């Protein structure tokens, strides 16, 4: 997972199912979520810096009051309704037609 500071994870790759979890108040620097299936996962009050979400699907998954900075969403299923009161700063969104 790459826990480096009190408040953050860094330089990690997740490429496995994430299921039935709630994460609050964490920063994630240079996180790579590659081919991940999120299932009933909530991130709350979290910061994502220079992360990559790639080929991810998600069910009952929410980002609540999260900030995304310099983050890339590449072929995710992340529609607007995945986010509640969230903030994007210099973020890129790519998807196949």
């Amino acid at each position: 997972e790459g826990r480096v500071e009190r408040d953050k994870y860094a330089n990690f790759t997740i490429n496995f199912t994430m299921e039935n979890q709630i994460h609050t108040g964490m920063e994630y620097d240079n996180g790579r979520f590659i081919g991940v299936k999120f299932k009933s996962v909530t991130f709350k009050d979290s910061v994502f810096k220079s992360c990559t979400f790639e080929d991810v699907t998600s069910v009952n998954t929410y980002f609540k009051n999260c900030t995304f900075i310099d983050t890339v969403f590449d072929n995710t299923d992340f529609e607007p309704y995945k986010f509640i009161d969230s903030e994007f700063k210099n973020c890129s969104f790519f998807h196949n037609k």
Partner: protein
Amino acid sequence: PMNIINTSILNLRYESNHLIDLSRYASKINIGSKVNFDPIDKNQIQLFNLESSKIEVILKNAIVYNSMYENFSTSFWIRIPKYFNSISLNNEYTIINCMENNSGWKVSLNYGEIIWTLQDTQEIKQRVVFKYSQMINISDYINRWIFVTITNNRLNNSKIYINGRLIDQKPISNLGNIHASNNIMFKLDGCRDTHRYIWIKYFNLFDKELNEKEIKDLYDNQSNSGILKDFWGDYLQYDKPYYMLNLYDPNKYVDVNNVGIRGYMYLKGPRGSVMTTNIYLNSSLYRGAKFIIKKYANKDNIVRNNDRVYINVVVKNKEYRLATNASQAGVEKILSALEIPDVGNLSQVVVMKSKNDQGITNKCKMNLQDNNGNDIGFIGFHQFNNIAKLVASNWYNRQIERSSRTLGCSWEFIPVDDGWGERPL
């Protein structure tokens, strides 16, 4: 230079290692210690949000404006970085200040705005405003060189022109005596965004209302049509990585399916988007393989019209050579990205050409040639089994220019720039 510049009341240019006024009046120029000049073109001046980042023109008393009736114009080029910070919403800041005792003129900026303000000695003011959106796929304006011309006819109207076209105007005949400042301060004034800056170039002041033709001539002359430009409007250069934009479908980017002579390059989309919540939403520009222009046939680094070059293509942080075998069947010669020592006798020499359009010379064409200098054709694309493969084709060279058929072979080169703020991939 043309007559209107020769007779300008101020002509601010970099020459022989100094920023000076070339006008007959030879006004004094004071430069602060934190003004940046672009080493490749020192007429391009960068001003930061810092006290010492300023230029002051102390005007000759003769040409100090203090009138009810004298018409005047100003022209300049500006390049304004994208707005990033919400503190920039509703924050008007002066950039070019000729106001004293609440009278005169000024150029100011705001989120998605260029503003011209006149104010008389009775406190009566009038504003003329150019607006551009940051919620737009590809902007002509955001972080790209813009030619601004502002004219003032004291009997009727003040006008703002952008890239030679009239955009806004407002009546000014309700303004009385205008007593402008003894000096002009080029400086960011009142800007709350600590990291804000501007680039400016070729400032001029004229003692008449410029007409449409004079404005068009001024725009065309200062466009530097002999030199190719990048997407942002800067000089196209050798040895600098560029993302590519094809003007027929700006919603695609260049990709390489495999390296080598059995592989091909193609256009793949959609580009997708880059955004900051409530601030901007644009088409992503930093996508796909990059092209590097290489010297073949001037000691400087600038790419000029009719320069013969090589093109390297950057695939996963390694450089390859753009090339084709012109013997392949058909008019359309599919391009490949070759290992550089492996290119052999393949066709790789490119004549850089500008599309002969009005304004900045940044719509570029690339005419592939064989090693005997024979045209293989402009680089565009062609559908093969629903795949838009890059090709060189002499069909392009047989078309009328300004015919929509040449859009396929028209490109823009986009380098990573500080004023854009997208993560490069």
